[PDB]
Amino acid sequence: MGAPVPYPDPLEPRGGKHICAICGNNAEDYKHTDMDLTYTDRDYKNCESYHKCSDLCQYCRYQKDLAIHHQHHHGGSMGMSGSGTGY
């Protein structure tokens, strides 16, 4: 159809899986800090950085995690990595 384009859809919601709208860091990880109030203790920003992620996702620096935001599964092969681990 040629309908998809690099740019997002007209809707472009402010919210996103990649960016936790609550604590700003449970996106990649699990909802653990969401339960706890950030007011009592705000998370320390990581000064160290490398590869400069597309947005601000910490783990994306090492290996991109655009799989969560994208509803459609990549279906890419696991490859050597992600296997043969200790547990």
Does residue number 58 form part of the binding site for Zn ion (CB under 5 A)? no
- Site residues for Zn ion, 8-27, by CB under 5 A, read 20, 22-23, 26
Position among 16, 17, 19, 34 found at the interface with Zn ion (CB under 5 A): 34
Query: Among 16, 17, 61, 65, which residue sits at the site for Zn ion (rule: CB under 5 A)?
Result: 65
Q: What is the 3-state secondary structure (H, E, C) of the chain?
A: CCCCCCCCCCCCCCCCCCCCCCCCCCCCCCCCCCCCCCCCCCCCCCCCCCCCCCCCCCHHHCCCCHHHHCCCCCCCCCCCCCCCCCC
- CB of 61: closest distance to Zn ion in angstroms? 9
| Binding residues vs Zn ion (CB under 5 A) | 20, 22-23, 26, 34, 57, 60, 65
